[PDB]
Amino acid sequence: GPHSMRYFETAVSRPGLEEPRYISVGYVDNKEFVRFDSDAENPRYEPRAPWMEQEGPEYWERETQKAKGQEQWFRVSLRNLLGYYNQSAGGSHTLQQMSGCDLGSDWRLLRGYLQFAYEGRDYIALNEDLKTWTAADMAAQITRRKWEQSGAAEHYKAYLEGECVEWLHRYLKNGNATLLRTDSPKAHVTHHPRSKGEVTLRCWALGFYPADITLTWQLNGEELTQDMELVETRPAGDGTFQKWASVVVPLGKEQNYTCRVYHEGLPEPLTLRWEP
Amino acid sequence: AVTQSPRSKVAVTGGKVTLSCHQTNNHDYMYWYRQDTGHGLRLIHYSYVADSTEKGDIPDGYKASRPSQENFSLILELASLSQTAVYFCASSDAGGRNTLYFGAGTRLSVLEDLRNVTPPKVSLFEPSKAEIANKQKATLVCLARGFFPDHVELSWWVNGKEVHSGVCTDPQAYKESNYSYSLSSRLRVSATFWHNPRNHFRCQVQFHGLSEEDKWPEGSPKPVTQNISAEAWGRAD
Amino acid sequence: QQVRQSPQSLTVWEGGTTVLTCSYEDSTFNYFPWYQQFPGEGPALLISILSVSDKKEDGRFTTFFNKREKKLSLHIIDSQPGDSATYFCAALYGNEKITFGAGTKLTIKPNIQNPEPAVYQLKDPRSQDSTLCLFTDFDSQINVPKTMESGTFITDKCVLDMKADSKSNGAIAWSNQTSFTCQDIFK
């Protein structure tokens, strides 16, 4: 199947004496696998998935040195941006980066990503050609010209087509068992008189992994598309997730309605109803 | 630009030396490298921000200072003999793959006794009549002798402007004795150019010695950095 | 150490192709810049290549990268006197600090067309009796003898080029006596 790797990096400047805080998080198939945080007593890249314990001390030492470089890069970049936008000192500012690759099951690079945001707004991005830049505003035009003049895109292209792909392959090989694990939802329906002769039926799904899930309500064999309220899928805090979906129905008709739960972990979708 | 100061330094063993670098690239990384008899670029110290520095590969005996984004100095508190070498400053954006931009280098000689520092005598030997007759060319030879240490640069000047065509200067000063070097160079021109009285030839020897930081007592000339020339006019003889 | 650059010096004939080579130890290195340094100047970036490529061409300069052998090379076609310089290979991974090789000193010398050796005596007019000896227009294959005696000095071969045809090899000798003459000292 398809696979992805991403590194999500954040530098945040602080008005006081302190240098910017720098955090980098690595993900494989959307699962956090390494993290570096300049605020730790011993800042270093740390494994965040059990399958990363295979890497030797030199992996961690050299990645840590890389992070240290990135941290200086972001400090300089933040200073430059403050000048581009004519911002006053003694504020706080956020620079973010996302980088990585999506691969097919034949290990072909499908797309490479390299993009930045400043103050939560898109700043500059490497286009899908891995050769040209899209710059969002006036300041980013300065950065784009600078990067075109130094031939920056070819270094990012080499990373995205080379190292990104090859390391992703290594990680997927090492983390195979673990990355395929699933926990199935347990589901049940609750009944809540809100009223004017109406009831809310709420269909709960609990304890499931990964977070991807679909809950639907139906009446007489049609899904209820518009009428249904949802909550965003939320972490239980033990590694599993939770979600619910509810419909408003007439009192006396509750038994007509069925909730369905679709999840990768299940041998088939669940189907359930208010059981008084 | 990356510009180093001074160009050349002669210091006493145990004396304090500061080499300075100024960069106008708005770069954040600065570096001091050591090169020895033309080989190596061995990192001594570097810095990625105003006010702090970081040890390189060979930091022993040297300190570094970064008083601003533009300036990075190298400090030898007690200069030893072993620190005689050529030092190069560089800047870069953010290090790693960012291109390094270098200064033009500073030659440092560290000596037990500064009374050995001596400027050259510069002599211009005129072309052989046999060469002019047999080959229709005239080779002038410039000879700088008796100088110490070997921080010399020799240039030729024809009618007030420097020439490179027809010149070969020895790459290395020749050590005649412990405290005495010599260097030669020759300039070859056509017989007719040499025979023209309107043509002025000058060998210039740039000697790098002491500066005005150095105090010198009253008995004798201070062997300061200076240009010393010998000259001749063409003649229809 | 990690970047091994040999030899210390190399001479190639004018017009010939210069081949400079380096090897590296760390197989993860992935950026390989060459710096060129002229006498009395600092090094300056000449050409660079990433490990995704096999070669990079710029005018008469080409650098080749071979991952399997961990070898870098720099080729200069139609080698010229103006290419005489020290060439440093270098290597790094990621954003780690550059490692420089020791540098190879390159000297491009002409293979003199029609040699015609002669030895002359020259005099310094600002002197009573000061003279020296000039050996000029000799073959590039000839070995200039070194001094077999104190007080007497003989310089190495120095090639000059009058730019309008007229390249020539030279060497100079001087001494501290009347008992030396010119036609002896050079053979």
Partner: peptide
């Protein structure tokens, strides 16, 4: 392994 950024912004 992470990207190593080149020129600063």
């Amino acid at each position: 392994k992470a990207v190593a950024n080149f020129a600063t912004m």
